[PDB]
C-alpha cells in the first residue's frame, strides 16, 4: 500500500537558507544535530537525482546505517524529494518511506516547510506502530535541521 500524510511547519528562517540547510548542507549538519549519526556518505551518484547516501550511525553499541536516495531536486522551486530505502530504522512492514518537500515563502521573510510523506507498506495495512511513528518520521529530520539553522544562522 502507499499511505501519504502531509505536514507543514512554519519557520522564521528565510526560504533559500532553510532549503540550503535541508539539501546542500544536510550531510554535514545532520551529524551535528543527531549524535548517533557519525557521517553521511555518498555511495552512488554525483549528487543530483538517483544519488544514494549511507547514513552511518551507532545506535548504542554498534555502527549501522540507513540508506537514503535522492529522487528529485529542484532548487529553483525549493523542492526536493528523497526516500529512506533501507537499513535499520526502516520498519519491517515498509518497502520505503518517500518524502516530497517544498519550502514556501511565509510572512515576515520566514518560510513554510510542506512535507508530504509516503509510507510504501509491504501489505495493505499501515501498522499502528508505524502510523504512531509517522510523527518522528514525518517532520523529525526537518525540525532538527531547522532548529540548528535557527540557532546557528552563520554555520
UniProtKB/Swiss-Prot annotation:
Keyword Calcium: yes
Tissue specificity comment: Expressed constitutively in roots.
Residues annotated to bind Ca(2+): 31, 37
Location in the cell: Cytoplasm, Cytosol
Highest taxon above the source species: Eukaryota
Role description: Class II ribonuclease (RNase). Binds to cytokinins. Interacts with melatonin.
Annotated protein name in UniProt: Protein LlR18A
Organism: Lupinus luteus (European yellow lupine)
